[PDB]
Amino acid sequence: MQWSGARALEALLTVAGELRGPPLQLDTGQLLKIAKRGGVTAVEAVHAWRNALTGAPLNLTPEQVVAIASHDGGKQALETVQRLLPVLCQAHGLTPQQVVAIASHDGGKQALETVQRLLPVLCQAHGLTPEQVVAIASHDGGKQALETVQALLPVLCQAHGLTPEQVVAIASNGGGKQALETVQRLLPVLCQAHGLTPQQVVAIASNGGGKQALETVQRLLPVLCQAHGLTPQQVVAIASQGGKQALETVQRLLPVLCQAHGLTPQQVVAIASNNGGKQALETVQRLLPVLCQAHGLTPQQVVAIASHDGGKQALETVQRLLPVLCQAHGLTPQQVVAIASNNGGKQALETVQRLLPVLCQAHGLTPEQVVAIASNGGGKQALETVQRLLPVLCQAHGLTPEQVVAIASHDGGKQALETVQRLLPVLCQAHGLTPQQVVAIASNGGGRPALESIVAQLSRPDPALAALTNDHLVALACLGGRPALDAVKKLEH
């Protein structure tokens, strides 16, 4: 290794191989993952006390152990969990999944210890739910957020008039301490002076690097409205999704993108108001010329692609794969744009490229279909899940390709497909639903929760005793999945 011993590497690969062995079954991918973000101590620690974690009172799974370990100060968090998980679950009624969630971050030790020490006073004397306290603690520097939340919550509600929900929202991100403090300082300023609603101020603070966004907004808000004729509501749009980098990068690249490349400021806002807005803007500054050419999109389409989380990646991947896709697999740019105009555009294109042949030949789909699957957020996930589950759904469960495509052709296709697999039997035989019904419920966004909800309402006939018959529940569930079904229970208090 890039050693801090002499000859110990020897004693430290004995260990590496044993973790592939009987308690944990670790492939390289994981050992890598641990080493990379955990360190050698992390890897040593896992071996050191692997048996203590898998049985005994903790009964963690390998995948959980990996999750806790693969972080800066993994060793500490592994050692801490051993001590505190039993007490946190018994003395404060948290589930293990919850303790593991807190542990699986940088400085987990500090979060776990701070949760034990402060969970009561937050729940008791500030009327917080433990769910909320876990939310605050489940990030980097939870200790800090927790502590800050204790100190400032009374102030922010009494003085600055905020709900506790709002304060939790702010604290429940990385660097929450900073955001909280920063809001305290700037809330009066930003509201009275710069004319913002406190709701907008929370929006801004309620992301990562919220401190940075707030500060930057106070600084740049007048400039952007005066010198670049933007509305405050647009400046907040940017500050809320893009943060400091985006605001700064907008000021900088707005004149350039409207003189030279000729975009409407309305569109520049659209591009910047996302994660890595900076990256998108800089990428569309370049690459816009060369996009539009050699397989040549209109500016509207470039904007469309860029106006999403990871726009840079989409744009770079489009420019790279647009030819091979259009020519070697015969797709109109119209369709490639569709695929790339969602979160994970890069992932979708790449997955399509590699899976198009497979799906069309081995499973007998038209391209029109494959593109419909890929033209949603999480395309890569749906495509890959179609591949796995198409055979077994058609045979074991007796469905048809067009139907499987219909389920998959929505946001969260993967989930719908998998959930159908789980529930199609129990629903059909045990509750007398027709497969056509089950597919109709699932052929929508939120298809999984729809299905899960509908089961729970029949299996253990929840509050509305018999009110509606099953064909209605299905109708409702297709009409607006879990929301509509939940909105019916909540009509008998």
Partner DNA sequence: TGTCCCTTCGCGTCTCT
Partner DNA sequence: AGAGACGCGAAGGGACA
Q: Under rule CB under 7 A, which residues in 164-203 are in contact with DNA?
A: 172, 174-179, 203
Q: Closest distance between DNA and the C-beta of residue 127, in Å?
A: 19
Give one word for 91, left, alpha or beta, with left for phi > 0 and alpha for psi -120 to 50: alpha
Q: Closest distance between DNA and the C-beta of residue 73, in Å?
A: 2
CA distance 28 to 17: 10
User: For 388, what's the count of Cα atoms within 13 Å in the CB-facing half-sphere?
Assistant: 12
Q: Closest distance between DNA and the C-beta of residue 158, in Å?
A: 24
Work out whether the CA dihedral 65, 69, 75, 81 comes out positive or negative.
Answer: negative
Q: Closest distance between DNA and the C-beta of residue 96, in Å?
A: 14
Would you say 300 or 434 has its CB closer to DNA?
A: 300
Number of neighbours of residue 323 by Cβ within 10 angstroms: 12
Would you say 1 or 361 has its CB closer to DNA?
A: 1
Q: Closest distance between DNA and the C-beta of residue 35, in Å?
A: 9
Contact by Cβ (8 Å): 49, 82: yes
By CB under 7 A, how many residues form the interface with DNA? 99
- Choosing from 60, 77, 318, 365, the residue that interacts with DNA (CB under 7 A) is 77
Q: Closest distance between DNA and the C-beta of residue 266, in Å?
A: 12
Residues contacting 160, CB < 8 A, separation 6+: 183, 184, 187, 188, 198
Selected range binding DNA among 18-26, 154-162, 325-333, 414-422, rule: CB under 7 A: 414-422
State which of positions 359-398 bind DNA (CB under 7 A). 377-382
Selected range binding DNA among 83-91, 135-143, 327-335, 470-478, rule: CB under 7 A: 135-143
Cα 189 to Cα 58, 59, 222: the distances in Å are 50, 51, 13
State which of positions 226-255 bind DNA (CB under 7 A). 237, 240, 242-246
Is residue 448 a contact residue for DNA (CB under 7 A)? yes
If you search the block for the tokens 């430290």, which residue do you land on?
Answer: 12
State which of positions 334-353 bind DNA (CB under 7 A). 342-348
State which of positions 79-108 bind DNA (CB under 7 A). 101, 104, 106-108
State which of positions 107-126 bind DNA (CB under 7 A). 107-111
Contact by Cβ (8 Å): 62, 26: yes
The 8-class DSSP code of residue 43 comes to H
Would you say 3 or 364 has its CB closer to DNA?
A: 3
Is residue 299 a contact residue for DNA (CB under 7 A)? no
Q: Closest distance between DNA and the C-beta of residue 293, in Å?
A: 23
Q: Closest distance between DNA and the C-beta of residue 376, in Å?
A: 8
- Choosing from 140, 234, 238, 303, the residue that interacts with DNA (CB under 7 A) is 140
If you search the block for the tokens 């939310």, which residue do you land on?
Answer: 135
CA distance 336 to 322: 7
Contact by Cβ (8 Å): 108, 71: yes
Would you say 90 or 264 has its CB closer to DNA?
A: 264
Q: Which phi and psi (to 5°) does residue 260 adopt?
A: -75, -50
CA distance 130 to 80: 20
Q: Closest distance between DNA and the C-beta of residue 178, in Å?
A: 4
Would you say 311 or 474 has its CB closer to DNA?
A: 311
Contact by Cβ (8 Å): 459, 432: no
Is residue 443 a contact residue for DNA (CB under 7 A)? no
Is residue 46 a contact residue for DNA (CB under 7 A)? no
- Choosing from 68, 85, 119, 280, the residue that interacts with DNA (CB under 7 A) is 280
Taking residues 54 to 73 in sequence order and writing x for each that binds DNA by CB under 7 A, - otherwise, the string is -------------x--x-xx
Is residue 447 a contact residue for DNA (CB under 7 A)? yes
Q: Which phi and psi (to 5°) does residue 50 adopt?
A: -85, -40
The Cα angle at residue 235 between residues 231 and 236, in degrees rounded to 5 = 115
Is residue 47 a contact residue for DNA (CB under 7 A)? no
- Choosing from 220, 312, 331, 393, the residue that interacts with DNA (CB under 7 A) is 312
- Choosing from 412, 437, 473, 478, the residue that interacts with DNA (CB under 7 A) is 412
Selected range binding DNA among 86-94, 357-365, 397-405, 409-417, rule: CB under 7 A: 409-417
Number of neighbours of residue 131 by Cβ within 10 angstroms: 11
The Cα angle at residue 295 between residues 289 and 297, in degrees rounded to 5 = 55
The 8-class DSSP code of residue 58 comes to T
Q: Closest distance between DNA and the C-beta of residue 315, in Å?
A: 10
Q: Enumerate residues preceding breaks in the chain (C to N > 2.5 Å).
A: none
Closest residue by Cα to residue 105 from 137, 150, 62, 127: 137
